[PDB]
Amino acid sequence: SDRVKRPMNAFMVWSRGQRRKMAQENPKMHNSEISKRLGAEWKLLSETEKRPFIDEAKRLRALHMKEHPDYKYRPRRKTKT
Numbered sequence: 001s002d003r004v005k006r007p008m009n010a011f012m013v014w015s016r017g018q019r020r021k022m023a024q025e026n027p028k029m030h031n032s033e034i035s036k037r038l039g040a041e042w043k044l045l046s047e048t049e050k051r052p053f054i055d056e057a058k059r060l061r062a063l064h065m066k067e068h069p070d071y072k073y074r075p076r077r078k079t080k081t
Helices: 010-025 032-043 047-065
Strands: none
Touching (some): 010 032
């Protein structure tokens, strides 16, 4: 499994994050029905839920740093080969 995890604005974040957390916690929702739910829930979005869009994104970026950094071609030698 090498599917990458990039930071994005609220809409995508809630789509990916909710799909992840809900699919694991309530297994039988994990497909198009989730997609239908989230779209509907988005239209009825309450401002209190606005903030976790951004916070969930912060965790997604944390998932990104859990992977190897952008460490590039060593100058001559690298003590982390």
